[PDB]
Amino acid sequence: NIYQFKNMIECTVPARSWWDFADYGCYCGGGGSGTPTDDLDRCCQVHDNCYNQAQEITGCRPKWKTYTYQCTQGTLTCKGRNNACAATTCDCDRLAAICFAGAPYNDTNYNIDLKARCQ
């Protein structure tokens, strides 16, 4: 669920408040269309698409599905006790958190005008 995803981000990117990723570019946070503004935005686009794929699983709701994962000593892991839905969304979240940690963060792309620049 979103609470867990937030914690994954805090796990992989300790040097930044997770809020910095809540409204970035065309894909991070609200909005899910247009051309990704940079590498970080591409991470969010992939995450968006991943959730769309997971929701094709019967009764699978990415934003609310509670999965089993662990974050210790710099390692993020999705546990083996997850059913197909939980396993899928945990992986979507894990890959995005890892993607975030290796992508540059440009302050100029934070809180941009989605209606005007993401068409």
From Swiss-Prot:
Its cofactor is Ca(2+). One of its GO terms (cellular component) is extracellular region. Disulfide bonds join 26-118, 28-44, 43-99, 50-92, 60-85, 78-90. Its EC number is 3.1.1.4. It is an enzyme of class 3 (hydrolase). Its main location: secreted. It comes from the Eukaryota. Ca(2+) binds at residues 27, 29, 31, 48. Transmembrane segments: none annotated. It catalyses: a 1,2-diacyl-sn-glycero-3-phosphocholine + H2O = a 1-acyl-sn-glycero-3-phosphocholine + a fatty acid + H(+). One of its GO terms (biological process) is phospholipid metabolic process. The keyword Disulfide bond applies. PLA2 catalyzes the calcium-dependent hydrolysis of the 2-acyl groups in 3-sn-phosphoglycerides. Heterodimer formed between two homologous isoforms: isoform 1 and isoform 2. Belongs to the phospholipase A2 family. Group I subfamily. D49 sub-subfamily. PANTHER family: PHOSPHOLIPASE A2, PHOSPHOLIPASE A2 FAMILY MEMBER. This is Basic phospholipase A2 1. It comes from Naja sagittifera.
